[model samples]
Target: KPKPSAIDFRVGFIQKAIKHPDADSLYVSTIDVGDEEGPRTVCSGLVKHFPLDAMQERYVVVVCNLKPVNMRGIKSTAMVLCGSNDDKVEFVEPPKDSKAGDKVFFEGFGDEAPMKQLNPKKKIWEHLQPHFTTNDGLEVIFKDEEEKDHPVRKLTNAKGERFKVASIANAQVR
Candidate 1:
């Protein structure tokens, strides 16, 4: 089984949201991931579910270390993480206390290095699928296989501080 340790997840905030020039259902967002270079662009295909007004200035969970992708003409450096079903899509909420650049760590796997450039052919994201989800409280969790049923309910940063989910407080992983 694949584990969640291979990825670097982080807390980020959407600094700006704009419609993608070439795509009808995509939004190009400037996301602040707490990097020295400042916020990076991420092209998210969520315009159908989230309006332009709603996406601006929102806190989000980000898959920080993925290789950049050229979506249409925009260079997207990272992926904004979210959960969805057939009816709706929602942003994966980070802890409320988290800032724009907090490192998200799963319990027992904080030491693993995140891939700097994800290999497209390997489908690493697919392999790491089961680990990311939300518990009943809308808090993002790492579904721990070794522990079974008892998921990792909280994510912390380097200083060992908990990140909190601010809204969508009752959503469940479906």
Candidate 2:
């Protein structure tokens, strides 16, 4: 049997949350998991359950490595997973004094197999909220993707800035 220190858990805090201008089911959120990998933008559909102020600075678990995706017009790079009990939804939080983005390892029998099977897609999170942050809501910055081709950057016209389909297709015949 291994010691308790061997367990790995990924819990983080909600750095910021903003309501979607055009959607009732969305909010743009940023989370700090202690990685200078910086913050991740999660387009949580928690608007129906949680209020905006209550979510700000709240500690929550997230699947840090979720591939970035765009929901509506917002680009979400991570997922904030929650549990549903009948009609209510609740989020998972880390224990008090637990550091953000802590990689918790399991020590029980057959832990990895079930975890692997259940989390084959990698968006499952076990969260524990310790406390909330008091930072002003406006100061939080949403990081944009450096690479233009990042899959999360969807919702665009057919033509990329550099070319139009007809023009590019006719270039060879020009």
Candidate 3:
């Protein structure tokens, strides 16, 4: 089993966003992570993937525990996690039932602490990359492995309630 303490993926809302002053392809966005912490500024390279008007008011998955980094003199407190393939870079769409500040976890794992650095002790992102896929209906499912004998997976919360994993949505998530 993978350890849960390697990454802290949390639900966040983009309260505000603007084109980076120095970087043409980056957006300086203010994200709301929840009550424990107020809003944080994140520098994301999403200008190509999303327009300025489209970036506002979007609920996104944030890697909240990563060490803050300075991007072109601006401090980025967290990373906006996304999924990508050959065609496009898509945001990981949180479920409808989730609100700003909700916690995200994989099935069989509870909430994990975000790593203090950009690189966690374990390769959590690497381990998760292969499983971030969709089903025939396009519903996001994290499979255990490549085997057909395994089953589609669900993510959960600290309370053990099952929820659909994040995937690109049309009108809502777009």
Candidate 4:
């Protein structure tokens, strides 16, 4: 098997979501991912795309181990993954039965450990993000066109359920 990427993606359920006091285009969300630190704070640029009511009590995929950064004065510890197409964006939805902190990993990488915190200077995410996209089946995946046979890996939860979108087929996932 090839080396597994260190990106730590997990299932996260939003406990609270409100408009960012500092950025109009951002939403400051508190999500419960079963993290030992309690709920984690994440800032997502979904103000114009998803309404506050729509964001409440939603389950979305979270990139768990990214280095925290301040987005418009708030230190966002994690990022919610979403898919985009033709100016429309939607969260990558996990299984309906998924709970906070259900392990999410790439296909065949479930045994690999994720990084505690991804080093920013390593540019690991920057280099790998472009591979994230949805297939014709509307399933979110990490695909490498540059690789031999163009391997496609599914974003799956602990139960082996694939992460997918609602109506956005063949969209870019970020």
Candidate 5:
């Protein structure tokens, strides 16, 4: 393939989360995505929404291959996806039985292989992310375009089990 076009989502276990020393609004987490090398350090602006205890050891959906970014002095390489509605945010959670490194994908886009890392300049994620939102069923879904008769595909795993968020229908997932 000339370039990867699909977004990579995976189950992650947040082993630990703590307030960022420099930012009150952010939490820095050490997560295990089942990478062979080791775990990844991620940064999230969820301190005001989630307590440190709630963030620890939670199995959550992670956008695995985003372009690395610098947050304060930390290099954040992955994102913990969450759903937010009316200022209430909940994790885009994996199934209770799911484990770290389980693959997550949109139904139709599952077959496409993801790039090692999304290239930022191309806006690969920017163009597609607007389509990501939870449906009435509270399942995270994607619409090619927000219009009548558009195919609203569910994000799922290899087993056909879809992702879910708590009590947040039509929520904006970020």
Candidate 6:
């Protein structure tokens, strides 16, 4: 068998955009491509037209299937599509079904789906980012503390089901 090269890229989509506290020309994004673990995070330099409202949720073509590369500190799992339309380079978007973490094809072949399989073992984190949960199944809340800034406070009812309290005071009985 032929040995694999050191440089190979994957295809994915952008799920969300996040502002980097340390950089002025970058935005960290969480992309979803229907992977077993869910969307992956990608940091890119798209601070220009990426409106504040457009930062969180939007569908953009990503190199879902690539060897994740590290930028400043964050590991970019995939690359977003960008090209020139008229004369200027613009962000290229995928179709409606096109989603975060979906694989991009080498050629225009529908049946060729899953044909170009790259190395999936090159993930930055061993596991997907941990989700927020309660200990005994309680509502989530936020609080201020000298030691810790934000803490989760869960709510509990008679049957053990959590209440839909949006605020801490509303969740608080006293």
The list of candidate 1 runs beyond 4 A from truth reads 146-154, 158-174
lDDT of 5 by residue, 47-88 (tens): 888888999889999888888889998999899998887869
lDDT of 2 at 79: 70
Task: Report, for every candidate in turn, its global Cα lDDT versus the true structure.
Answer: 0.74, 0.47, 0.69, 0.85, 0.85, 0.44
lDDT of 1 by residue, 60-160 (tens): 87887667888988899989877665566777766556788777777676888877766767777776675666556666666666776654645556777
Put down candidate 2 lDDT per residue, 9-69, tens digits, no spaces: 3556787889887778988888876677798777888899889997999776565543457
Q: For each candidate, what TM-score against the reference?
A: 0.81, 0.55, 0.74, 0.93, 0.92, 0.50
Name model 6 segments beyond 4 Å from true: 1-14, 85-87, 97-174
* Candidate 2 residue-wise lDDT at 4: 17
Candidate with more favorable, higher TM-score: 2 or 6: 2
| Residue lDDT tens for model 4, 1-174 | 123358888889998999999799999999998889899999999999988999999998898888898899999999999999987998899977898888888886678788788877877888787778998889998886656764888888777788899889888888
Higher-lDDT candidate of 2 and 3: 3
Give the higher-lDDT candidate: 2 or 4.
Answer: 4
Error of 4 at 29 (Å): 0.4
Decoy 2 TM-score against native: 0.55
CA lDDT, candidate 1, residue 147: 75
Indicate the residue-level lDDT of 18 in model 4: 94
Report the error of model 1 at residue 132, Å: 2.2
Instruction: State the TM-score for model 4.
Output: 0.93
List the candidate 3 regions with Cα displacement exceeding 4 Å. Answer: 1-5, 111-122, 146-152, 156-174
* Candidate 4: clashing pairs of residues: none
10 residues in a row with least lDDT, candidate 3: 165-174
